Amino acid sequence: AITTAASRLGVAPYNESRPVELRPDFSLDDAKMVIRAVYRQVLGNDYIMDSERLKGAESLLTNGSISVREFVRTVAKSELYKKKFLYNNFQTRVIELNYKHLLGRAPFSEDEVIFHLDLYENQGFDADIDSYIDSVEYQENFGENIVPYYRFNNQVGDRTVGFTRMFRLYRGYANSDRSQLERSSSRLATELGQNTVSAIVGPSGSNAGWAYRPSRAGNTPAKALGGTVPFGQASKLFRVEITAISAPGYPKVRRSNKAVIVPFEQLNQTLQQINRLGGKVASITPASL
Amino acid sequence: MKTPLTEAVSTADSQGRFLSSTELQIAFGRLRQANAGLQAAKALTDNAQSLVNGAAQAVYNKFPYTTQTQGNNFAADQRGKDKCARDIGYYLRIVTYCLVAGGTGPLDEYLIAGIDEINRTFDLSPSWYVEALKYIKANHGLSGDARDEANSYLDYAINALS
Amino acid sequence: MKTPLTEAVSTADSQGRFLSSTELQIAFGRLRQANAGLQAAKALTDNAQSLVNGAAQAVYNKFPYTTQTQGNNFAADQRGKDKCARDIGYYLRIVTYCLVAGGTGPLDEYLIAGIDEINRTFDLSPSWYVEALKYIKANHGLSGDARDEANSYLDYAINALS
Amino acid sequence: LPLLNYAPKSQNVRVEGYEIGSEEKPVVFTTENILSSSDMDNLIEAAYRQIFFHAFKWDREKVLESQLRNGQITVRDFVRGLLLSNTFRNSFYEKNSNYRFVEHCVQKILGRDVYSEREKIAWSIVVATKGYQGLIDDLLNSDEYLNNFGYDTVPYQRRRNLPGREAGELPFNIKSPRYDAYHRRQLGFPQIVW
Amino acid sequence: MFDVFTRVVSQADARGEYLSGSQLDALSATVAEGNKRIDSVNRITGNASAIVSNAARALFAEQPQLIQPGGNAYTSRRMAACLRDMEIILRYVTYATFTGDASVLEDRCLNGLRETYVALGVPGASVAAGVQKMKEAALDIVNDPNGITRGDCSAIVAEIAGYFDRAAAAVA
Amino acid sequence: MFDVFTRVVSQADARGEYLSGSQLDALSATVAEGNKRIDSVNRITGNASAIVSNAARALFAEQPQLIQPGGNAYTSRRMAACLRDMEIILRYVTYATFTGDASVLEDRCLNGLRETYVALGVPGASVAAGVQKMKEAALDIVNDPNGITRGDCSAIVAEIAGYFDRAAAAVA
Amino acid sequence: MFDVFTRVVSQADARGEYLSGSQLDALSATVAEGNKRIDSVNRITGNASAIVSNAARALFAEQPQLIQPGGNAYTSRRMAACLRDMEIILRYVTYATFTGDASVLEDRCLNGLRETYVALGVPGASVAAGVQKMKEAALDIVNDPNGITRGDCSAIVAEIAGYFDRAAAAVA
Amino acid sequence: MFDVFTRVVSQADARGEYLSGSQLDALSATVAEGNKRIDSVNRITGNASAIVSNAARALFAEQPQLIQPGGNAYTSRRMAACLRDMEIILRYVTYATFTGDASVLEDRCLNGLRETYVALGVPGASVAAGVQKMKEAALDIVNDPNGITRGDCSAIVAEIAGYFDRAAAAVA
Numbered sequence A: 001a002i003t004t005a006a007s008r009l010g011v012a013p014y015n016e017s018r019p020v021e022l023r024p025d026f027s028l029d030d031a032k033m034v035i036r037a038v039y040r041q042v043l044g045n046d047y048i049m050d051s052e053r054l055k056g057a058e059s060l061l062t063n064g065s066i067s068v069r070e071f072v073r074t075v076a077k078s079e080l081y082k083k084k085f086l087y088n089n090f091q092t093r094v095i096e097l098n099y100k101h102l103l104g105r106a107p108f109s110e111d112e113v114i115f116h117l118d119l120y121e122n123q124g125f126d127a128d129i130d131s132y133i134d135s136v137e138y139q140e141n142f143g144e145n146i147v148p149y150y151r152f153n154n155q156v157g158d159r160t161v162g163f164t165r166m167f168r169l170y171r172g173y174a175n176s177d178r179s180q181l182e183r184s185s186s187r188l189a190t191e192l193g194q195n196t197v198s199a200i201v202g203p204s205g206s207n208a209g210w211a212y213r214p215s216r217a218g219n220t221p222a223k224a225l226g227g228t229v230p231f232g233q234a235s236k237l238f239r240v241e242i243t244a245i246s247a248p249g250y251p252k253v254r255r256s257n258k259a260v261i262v263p264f265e266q267l268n269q270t271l272q273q274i275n276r277l278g279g280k281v282a283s284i285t286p287a288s289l
Numbered sequence B, C: 001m002k003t004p005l006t007e008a009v010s011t012a013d014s015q016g017r018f019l020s021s022t023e024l025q026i027a028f029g030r031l032r033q034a035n036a037g038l039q040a041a042k043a044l045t046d047n048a049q050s051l052v053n054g055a056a057q058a059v060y061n062k063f064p065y066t067t068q069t070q071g072n073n074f075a076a077d078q079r080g081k082d083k084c085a086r087d088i089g090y091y092l093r094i095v096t097y098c099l100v101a102g103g104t105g106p107l108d109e110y111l112i113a114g115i116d117e118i119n120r121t122f123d124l125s126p127s128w129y130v131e132a133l134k135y136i137k138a139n140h141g142l143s144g145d146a147r148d149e150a151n152s153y154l155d156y157a158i159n160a161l162s
Numbered sequence D: 001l002p003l004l005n006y007a008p009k010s011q012n013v014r015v016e017g018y019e020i021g022s023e024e025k026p027v028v029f030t031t032e033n034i035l036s037s038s039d040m041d042n043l044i045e046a047a048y049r050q051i052f053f054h055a056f057k058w059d060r061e062k063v064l065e066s067q068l069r070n071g072q073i074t075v076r077d078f079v080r081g082l083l084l085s086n087t088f089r090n091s092f093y094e095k096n097s098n099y100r101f102v103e104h105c106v107q108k109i110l111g112r113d114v115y116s117e118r119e120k121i122a123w124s125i126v127v128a129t130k131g132y133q134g135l136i137d138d139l140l141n142s143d144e145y146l147n148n149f150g151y152d153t154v155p156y157q158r159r160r161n162l163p164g165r166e167a168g169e170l171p172f173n174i175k176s177p178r179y180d181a182y183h184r185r186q187l188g189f190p191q192i193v194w
Numbered sequence E, F, G, H: 001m002f003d004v005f006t007r008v009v010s011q012a013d014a015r016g017e018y019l020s021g022s023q024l025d026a027l028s029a030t031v032a033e034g035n036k037r038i039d040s041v042n043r044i045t046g047n048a049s050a051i052v053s054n055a056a057r058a059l060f061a062e063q064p065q066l067i068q069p070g071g072n073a074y075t076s077r078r079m080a081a082c083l084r085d086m087e088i089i090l091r092y093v094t095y096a097t098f099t100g101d102a103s104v105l106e107d108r109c110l111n112g113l114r115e116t117y118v119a120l121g122v123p124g125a126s127v128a129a130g131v132q133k134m135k136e137a138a139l140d141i142v143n144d145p146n147g148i149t150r151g152d153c154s155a156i157v158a159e160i161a162g163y164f165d166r167a168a169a170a171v172a
């Protein structure tokens, strides 16, 4: 599980949050809890005004006319969901959001993008939503009566690439999935296309270097190809992600976010230099050996 | 890590060059020294406990105050004696590592770098360890190139301390 | 050479700016501390010989081996005792210089910089000088601001040695 | 041991020049501009001229160039690799005294002339005490270097030309060739003609 | 970085209002409690080496696997790095005590410190334990009643304890 | 994923021509080595629990800081996550041995594991040490000449060792 | 970087133990193999230019899409980068052969190379094929019997083959 | 560099002697003058722009050839360089007044300044005249009796005048 780093990430509130299940012969609080959980999770923690609430779907779920899975399907096919997540987004971002909301996980590979983009283009959005919800993964994780939840912990058919990409899609508890730094841009297009991973940067209030985002181009690669040779004698190399660089001012500072591969022996100096340039360290990852 | 093969390759690589006859001669010298170094390491290992106990006793004899003066940095009680024997064992074992590797690289990376800050911080005198290393020099019972290489490492530690 | 006035001007010049109210407050603090520091320097100066002799004797009491072990680094003979008293006098005089200047600058420039290489090379243990400085702290008989500033310099020297 | 204290000297770089970009403003070769391969060739050649004056293809470091192109290393790291390279050690360190190696290090890393003989004297002990790379890293991690060129810009001779003047100070590749009269007489030059 | 005055200055500037009378006399109280803050900084500084060395000895006694071979504090270089780290944490805690604001500690010491320990394999819990030992020793030295003008230093001791706690939480 | 045949198939399709005679002969050679590949997979799988438990015991013995209170293998939840990770790495190494290709191990298990361990505070160097211990145990299990039709299995053992090396390098 | 001696030394130092008799005798066996190691390094080095050029020529002959207009080896700078990548791989193989350890080849040549090739669009499989060509040429040069003291060099040849296969597996 | 105290300290250390009673009393007398020194620094600082601008205007009124075309102060950049030079000389004079020693003025402002002016063709005599005009305006500002605690500031005025003359003589 995630214990020591749960609070630093946004995982701690979901560690003591048990899955919301609608039992047979449920009470009215159970129905309202299912409605609340579905709104929070399927709509990605957006505030839901009263005028946008799906009154009929709520009534049907309360009555038992539809299951939790059907209510999730109705919410995901609603005009509210399409306004929030479909009409203003690149379809790869739509797929990321679908996986995050309906399956509680990030996409694993480019094959899922292929399948979902082909299915949207050939049969429409409703059929694509159905494929998320009628999937074997959905059935094994949530089934018919459980609200989908974030699957932070390791499971049977996982890939660790999904664990890394979850924190690219999830940015903290007080965050709303339409209120993230990257806004409407797809977070995983480059990663899924290149089968790569990014160093995990935690949410704002727990991580000073939360705002680090690589640019379109001119990014320092993950590994130190060449070893320690350009740095003279060095023991080990580290990739350091730095955000909020401002002190020298333009033109000395062009991009406020910079990744640098530095030797172990210059780590002290690198940290002091970061403090001087007013930056915040987002992550430090071994780059050699 | 300062050993003949790694240093030859690192110098060649920093120059971006293939290994030339200079690096081959470095390898040949390493091959000439390697068997004697390995035998010296074996002889030191086989006699490790006796050398360490005798070195600690020689230090206690030359600096008697280390055995009856109270304090964390002394060997008055059994705790300080255990720390002293462990330190001398560290010295001897890393010297054997140097004999295996054919250079002072193990001493530099494991023991030499930062030893002065340790000695100043914990109020440990380098002269104690110098006497221990002199005991190891006088009683390792080596000869020839084994003795010369082992004495070179022990003198390296002594010079780094004194 | 770290003193409040020179540090204030160094900070202003590094930023290329005139002396603002921050540096004026620095000078005001220097003026507030100055008279106490100068009387303390005078008090230490008048009682310098007895303080140096007592500190040397205290070191000899705390480390008796320094008084009868032969060697250049010990005070077994009169020459070693003269060297020890001279070193303690150096410490006390530079501490008075620090009191006059209002900062650890004289200690940094005259004594602190390079003392580790001195002690390692001539096999002088810094614990001896730590004992001398502790005697000086306990026996200078100062009070208030003067005692606080002089004790700050003596603890600065102790921390450098340890 | 701390560095000797040496007094600065009046220099153009010490004083505000109110510079407006012109033909005498050194070209800013920076990887912050996402340079194409040909612009990277130009930047790389600027680094070779700054560090080695001229780089024969025996002097080139193709591995370092590939690493800089890929983004493995910064421009400052490439400059360090040039200074740690065999060309720089053979031409500028080996053939000169320690004092005239500090010059050829202040001049082409910091882009300014040495304050005095005392600065040369003070920095000359660093090679023998902290190592060659110790000197290189001290100059590259200095506040002067980072404030002027940072990590991403090739260093250059700073404030060589004042506005309106026909000629500025001598370019450091003219003022200070790789060696001087010491290695000149070790080689046996000057040679008599005819 | 911020000091105690500069922190309320920045808050007031963000609100765009003059410092109120309550803020002004809270600052006057801070100034009035200035001598004790200076004494605390001086006492921690004058015993810094003893604090670091004693805390290191206690920490390595309670956690011998740190210093055994293969342990992160084994070899001279890693031991020296550990000692230096302890001294750095103590120095920045003294800086934060001097300023009256923990901005210097966050921005200049703990910025990237967890990440660095993780990347290197430094056990964050153990360095947090070392920071706690330095906390007990430093608070003991600050609260020493001998050789000083008696007074209530509970507020400054609590502030120093908060700086140490924030450092320990930052590294673990 | 890719197996040993589909790898050369994908390369040929990228090139747009038929597998050559040498490629078909190399594949036939790999087919002829299939019984020993199956034997190695079976032997590691049959001893998987012993490999994981023994290597975890050896790892926590040589690195007691992992299991000290405050260490990353301390508490049941963490110990169990660690044991599960080692079994997962062993399982994907066996998968790579079975397919004759490392793609399943790289793409499903190793890609992003280093970033994951850094984010969680899991010490990747110790994970690499545990992986090396599973390597030595599994290699000695595959080479055991008792109860098997004798033959040279050095190529298969070298391939398994390479998969273990990729796993150990991916976590540090 | 580890050579053959420093690898075992570092493992022993981490375990906190002296090298056992078996480890010392294995190192002695490596020492007895040193002359053949130096010959193999010298022979590959002596024909490095021919190996790289002939391997590239054969690779471009059997894969014309590399050197077609718009292919990845088209334009002089990209062709020179390709020839350079071949020479670098061969040089690091020689470094690994000289040290008796793959640490130099792993750390300074192969770490991150697959990611770089994928990012740029350099076909890693074609690079692996070129590396295989240098493999076969190099191993034929090392095994050439005339003008050298006759001896069994099968172990050294197998070690060089392993380095070449490791490079080919890393780039693809 | 040096201040008043550090100059005597350096001289005593070269002599290897304690500061005598006379030197300590002289330094105490300097301390008693400290408030007037701070007032002088503050008054020159608070009117630095007026001092520089008025002295420059007077200098160019009595030496019109400086600002005539072809003159050294002609063109905005040169004229601005001249104003900046005058400001720098005044700033280092204030530094010398603050520290009470001329070391900062000699080491950081006047060291090599004559040679710089000779190389650039800047008329050093005219720079000295501008410095003198700064001196007279600054001394009148330091001696203004309005809005200050009355006392005899003759010594600090003479010291500031000496610094100004030193700056003028370094360039004349």
Ligand SMILES: *[C@@H](C)[C@H]1/C(=C/c2[nH]c(/C=C3N=C(/C=C4\NC(=O)C(CC)=C4C)C(C)=C\3CCC(=O)O)c(CCC(=O)O)c2C)NC(=O)[C@@H]1C
Binding pocket: F032, F033, F034, F035, F036, F037, F038, F039, F040, F042, F142, F143, F144, F145, F146, F148, F149, F150, F151, F152, F153, F156
């Ligand atoms: C290195 C891997 C070790 C080794 C192996 C080895 N095995 C064989 C032969 C066979 N092994 C099997 C195995 C199985 N049959 C089954 O029904 C199952 C259970 C599902 C298994 C795993 C088979 C079918 C054969 C062929 C018949 C036989 O029993 O011999 C060989 C011989 C060569 C071959 O490829 O067939 C070898 C070499 N030998 C060693 O010495 C290593 C310790």
Ligand SMILES: *[C@@H](C)[C@H]1/C(=C/c2[nH]c(/C=C3N=C(/C=C4\NC(=O)C(CC)=C4C)C(C)=C\3CCC(=O)O)c(CCC(=O)O)c2C)NC(=O)[C@@H]1C
Binding pocket: B021, B024, B025, G032, G033, G034, G035, G036, G037, G038, G039, G040, G042, G142, G143, G144, G145, G148, G149, G150, G151, G152, G153, G156
């Ligand atoms: C397989 C690699 C081939 C092989 C090698 C082989 N070499 C020797 C012996 C020696 N080779 C050398 C090498 C050099 N001498 C030099 O001065 C240079 C340039 C610096 C080189 C490269 C040396 C010194 C020896 C020892 C003396 C001798 O000339 O024989 C052997 C013999 C065994 C040994 O380990 O010494 C062997 C086997 N032999 C083959 O047949 C392979 C094709």
Ligand SMILES: *[C@H](C)[C@H]1/C(=C/c2[nH]c(/C=C3N=C(/C=C4\NC(=O)C(CC)=C4C)C(C)=C\3CCC(=O)O)c(CCC(=O)O)c2C)NC(=O)[C@@H]1C
Binding pocket: A045, A046, A047, A048, A173, A174, A175, A176, A179
């Ligand atoms: C009000 C004082 C200021 C202000 C606020 C404002 N906030 C938003 C949007 C969001 N606020 C939150 C915060 C939370 N959601 C939670 O669940 C929690 C607890 C865990 C918190 C703290 C979120 C996540 C959002 C985004 C969700 C959404 O539906 O917007 C807005 C709306 C912005 C917009 O609609 O574009 C606003 C306006 N605005 C001001 O001007 C005040 C200073």
Ligand SMILES: *[C@H](C)[C@H]1/C(=C/c2[nH]c(/C=C3N=C(/C=C4\NC(=O)C(CC)=C4C)C(C)=C\3CCC(=O)O)c(CCC(=O)O)c2C)NC(=O)[C@@H]1C
Binding pocket: A090, A091, A092, A113, A114, A117
């Ligand atoms: C055809 C003229 C050129 C070409 C096309 C090509 N594209 C892909 C793959 C993808 N294209 C997309 C595009 C979109 N995603 C969206 O969200 C939108 C609509 C809102 C668009 C237009 C995506 C996401 C992919 C990836 C998924 C997929 O592969 O289908 C490919 C395949 C790439 C591969 O290697 O798999 C191709 C071939 N290629 C050419 O050569 C033409 C010039």
Ligand SMILES: *[C@H](C)[C@H]1/C(=C/c2[nH]c(/C=C3N=C(/C=C4\NC(=O)C(CC)=C4C)C(C)=C\3CCC(=O)O)c(CCC(=O)O)c2C)NC(=O)[C@@H]1C
Binding pocket: A001, A002, A003, A004, A005, A006, A152, A153, A154, A155, A158, A159, A160, A163, F066, F071, F072, F073, F077, F078, F079, F081, F082, F083, F085, F086, F088, F089, F108, F109, F113, F116, F120, F122, F123, F126, F127, F130
């Ligand atoms: C054991 C040798 C070391 C160790 C391990 C450890 N790991 C975790 C947590 C996780 N491990 C993974 C890894 C994977 N997830 C996958 O899906 C895959 C296979 C495809 C892998 C390899 C992940 C993602 C996590 C977090 C999520 C989860 O655990 O479910 C922990 C727990 C950390 C914590 O509780 O915060 C531990 C302890 N720790 C050591 O000290 C050993 C060196």
Ligand SMILES: *[C@H](C)[C@H]1/C(=C/c2[nH]c(/C=C3N=C(/C=C4\NC(=O)C(CC)=C4C)C(C)=C\3CCC(=O)O)c(CCC(=O)O)c2C)NC(=O)[C@@H]1C
Binding pocket: A245, A246, A247, A248, A249, A250, A253, A254, A255, A256
């Ligand atoms: C003005 C319309 C808005 C605004 C601006 C604002 N910007 C900054 C700071 C920076 N802006 C840059 C700019 C660039 N980097 C580049 O490389 C490029 C292209 C060449 C550009 C345009 C950078 C690097 C910084 C940081 C360093 C610097 O300040 O120079 C600030 C200051 C932010 C701070 O608090 O430090 C501001 C205010 N802000 C608004 O409110 C407007 C909407």
Ligand SMILES: *[C@H](C)[C@H]1/C(=C/c2[nH]c(/C=C3N=C(/C=C4\NC(=O)C(CC)=C4C)C(C)=C\3CCC(=O)O)c(CCC(=O)O)c2C)NC(=O)[C@@H]1C
Binding pocket: B059, B060, B066, B067, B072, B073, B074, B075, B076, B079, B080, B081, B083, B084, B085, B087, B088, B090, B091, B110, B111, B118, B122, B124, B128, B129, B132, E057, E060, E067, E073, E074, E075, E076, E079
């Ligand atoms: C023996 C010659 C004398 C002596 C010894 C003594 N040493 C210590 C404590 C330490 N010794 C070391 C040394 C090393 N640890 C390393 O990692 C390495 C490299 C392999 C070396 C050489 C260190 C770091 C310490 C301090 C921390 C630790 O516990 O290891 C002590 C204890 C002092 C204390 O305050 O605990 C003692 C007593 N003392 C004598 O009087 C002997 C003559």
Ligand SMILES: *[C@H](C)[C@H]1/C(=C/c2[nH]c(/C=C3N=C(/C=C4\NC(=O)C(CC)=C4C)C(C)=C\3CCC(=O)O)c(CCC(=O)O)c2C)NC(=O)[C@@H]1C
Binding pocket: C059, C060, C063, C066, C067, C072, C073, C074, C075, C076, C079, C080, C081, C083, C084, C085, C087, C088, C090, C091, C110, C111, C115, C118, C122, C124, C128, C129, C132
């Ligand atoms: C006295 C506490 C112990 C002691 C002293 C002792 N010291 C030396 C030698 C030197 N002491 C110094 C120190 C300084 N010189 C300076 O200029 C200053 C700064 C102003 C200091 C602190 C130096 C440099 C030396 C060596 C050169 C010299 O001889 O002056 C010795 C003699 C060592 C030798 O080898 O001759 C001695 C005996 N001895 C004790 O036993 C006391 C406990």
Ligand SMILES: *[C@H](C)[C@H]1/C(=C/c2[nH]c(/C=C3N=C(/C=C4\NC(=O)C(CC)=C4C)C(C)=C\3CCC(=O)O)c(CCC(=O)O)c2C)NC(=O)[C@@H]1C
Binding pocket: D009, D010, D011, D012, D014, D015, D016, D017, D018, D162, D163, D165, H066, H071, H072, H073, H077, H078, H079, H081, H082, H083, H085, H086, H088, H089, H108, H109, H110, H113, H116, H120, H122, H123, H126, H127, H130
């Ligand atoms: C004004 C009173 C007179 C005058 C001045 C003048 N000076 C310059 C140029 C420079 N002045 C300096 C001086 C300094 N550099 C230092 O390091 C120090 C201490 C910090 C000082 C005071 C230097 C180096 C220059 C050249 C660099 C630059 O100008 O940016 C000029 C400009 C000359 C030119 O050719 O542009 C002028 C005009 N000239 C007069 O006529 C007045 C008498």
Ligand SMILES: *[C@H](C)[C@H]1/C(=C/c2[nH]c(/C=C3N=C(/C=C4\NC(=O)C(CC)=C4C)C(C)=C\3CCC(=O)O)c(CCC(=O)O)c2C)NC(=O)[C@@H]1C
Binding pocket: A264, A265, A267, A268, A269, A271, A272, E066, E071, E072, E073, E077, E078, E079, E081, E082, E083, E085, E086, E088, E108, E109, E110, E113, E116, E120, E122, E123, E126, E127, E130
């Ligand atoms: C000691 C209580 C624990 C411990 C310490 C330890 N730390 C390191 C290495 C580093 N520590 C830092 C931290 C800083 N550097 C700075 O300049 C500052 C101020 C901003 C801080 C806080 C850094 C950057 C490093 C690496 C760089 C360096 O030169 O060390 C080590 C060494 C790790 C290694 O060598 O691999 C150690 C051992 N270890 C323990 O076991 C204690 C719990």
Ligand SMILES: *[C@H](C)[C@H]1/C(=C/c2[nH]c(/C=C3N=C(/C=C4\NC(=O)C(CC)=C4C)C(C)=C\3CCC(=O)O)c(CCC(=O)O)c2C)NC(=O)[C@@H]1C
Binding pocket: C033, C144, C145, C146, C148, C149, C152, E032, E033, E034, E035, E036, E038, E039, E040, E042, E142, E143, E144, E145, E148, E149, E150, E151, E152, E153, E156
């Ligand atoms: C609080 C933790 C402890 C404590 C402190 C305390 N101190 C004072 C007063 C003073 N302390 C100083 C300090 C210095 N003078 C110097 O010259 C130096 C070096 C530069 C220092 C550090 C001063 C100037 C004063 C004021 C005059 C005086 O001597 O009293 C007080 C008194 C109240 C006040 O705030 O001034 C107190 C309470 N007392 C304790 O009992 C705590 C353990």
Ligand SMILES: *[C@H](C)[C@H]1/C(=C/c2[nH]c(/C=C3N=C(/C=C4\NC(=O)C(CC)=C4C)C(C)=C\3CCC(=O)O)c(CCC(=O)O)c2C)NC(=O)[C@@H]1C
Binding pocket: A225, A226, D063, D064, D065, D066, D067, D069, D070, G066, G071, G072, G073, G077, G078, G079, G081, G082, G083, G085, G086, G088, G089, G108, G109, G113, G116, G120, G122, G123, G126, G127, G130
């Ligand atoms: C040749 C067999 C194949 C080929 C190669 C090719 N590679 C690149 C570009 C790069 N190659 C590297 C590799 C290294 N540089 C290093 O420093 C190290 C470690 C010492 C290695 C192994 C790098 C870093 C690059 C990128 C930067 C650079 O320009 O060098 C190219 C050029 C691609 C481009 O210019 O965009 C090429 C062509 N291409 C083929 O088609 C062959 C199969």
